[PDB]
Design a protein around this ligand. Structure first.
Ligand SMILES: CCOC(=O)c1csc(-c2nc(-c3csc([C@@H](N)CCCNC(=N)N)n3)oc2C)n1
Ligand SMILES: Nc1ncnc2c1ncn2[C@@H]1O[C@H](CSCC[C@H](N)C(=O)O)[C@@H](O)[C@H]1O
Length: 266
């Protein structure tokens, strides 16, 4: 039962979040994230851009980046499009300070993402939740809120750790502190089993809203999917994929990620 599952794992998520709110821990988390999670960024972004284009045959007018960190995703998107409404939200004041220093045409908000409605009213074409879902105290509540911010043609794209991938995660750790960090992060994560239930519950009563979940490398779409084929026709995604090859080991040696889509098409 997903509501119960989420409630009972709340303490784990609180503990994982200390790695972003406590001064000493935050140094460990930033260093690890920069070194080991930067490579996927381009892939994840080009995946949602290709999805959007394949689904609605236009570029998104707006992107909202949840847990935007130091603004790296927004920076990438800003260099990509001539005109796009970019908004990033993160509860770390240091992170938002860093994002604002980039001097980019974007709105950066420092707040719990739970509070998004206090700052944003315009419906968003894409809401991106990259590598932060398991940090939310109330992840169902935040998703319900974000669904209300979706435009008539839109998606939430969530990429996050799968709890059972801890072992492969630990193989990328380069210190005892990093080991402790990942142990806490993976403990707070969902499994595919849980994540599917979560996506089902938040979408089932919502007219014109559907979901997709998967752990395959490319948006969680497996190689049999017609949506997958459409995604892969996109040159920008193809180029990001080709470029990435030299940074990675065999698939079985890398941590599997959860990929979830909440898709609105009214
Ligand atoms: C290119 C192939 O990619 C890989 O081979 C690869 C190796 S390690 C890795 C990865 N490790 C994280 C991660 C750990 S801690 C964190 C923080 N952002 C906090 C996570 C918060 N979420 C949860 N705890 N659930 N990210 O993200 C990614 C994509 N990917
Ligand atoms: N409730 C919340 N609201 C907004 N941001 C949050 C949050 N809990 C954690 N975060 C932020 O989530 C981020 C996780 S690490 C950075 C994730 C980033 N999206 C990336 O692509 O790598 C941290 O910057 C942390 O400050």
């Amino acid at each position: 039962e997903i509501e119960t599952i989420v409630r009972e794992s709340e303490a784990n998520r609180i503990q994982a979040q200390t790695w972003f709110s406590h001064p000493e821990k935050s140094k460990v988390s930033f260093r690890y994230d920069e070194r080991e999670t930067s490579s996927i960024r381009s892939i994840s972004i080009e995946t949602f851009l290709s999805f959007y284009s394949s689904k609605f045959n236009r570029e998104p007018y707006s992107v909202l980046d949840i847990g935007c960190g130091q603004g790296q995703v927004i920076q990438y998107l800003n260099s990509r499009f001539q005109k796009i409404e970019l908004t990033g939200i993160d509860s770390s004041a240091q992170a938002i300070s860093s994002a604002k220093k980039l001097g980019i045409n974007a709105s950066f908000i420092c707040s719990n993402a739970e509070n998004i409605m206090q700052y944003v009213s315009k419906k968003q074409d894409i809401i991106f939740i990259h590598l932060c879902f398991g940090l939310f105290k109330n992840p169902i509540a935040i998703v319900n809120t974000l669904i209300h911010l979706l435009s008539d043609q839109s998606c939430i794209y969530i990429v996050d750790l799968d709890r059972n991938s801890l072992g492969e995660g630990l193989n990328t750790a380069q210190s005892r502190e990093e080991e402790a960090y990942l142990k806490d992060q993976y403990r707070a994560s969902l499994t595919m089993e849980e994540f599917k239930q979560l996506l089902h519950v938040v979408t089932k009563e919502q007219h014109g809203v559907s979901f997709h979940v998967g752990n395959s490398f490319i948006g969680g779409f497996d190689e049999t999917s017609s949506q997958f084929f459409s995604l892969m026709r996109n040159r920008n995604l193809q180029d990001a994929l080709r470029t990435s090859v030299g940074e990675q080991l065999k698939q079985s040696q890398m941590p599997a990620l959860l990929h979830g889509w909440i898709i609105k098409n009214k």
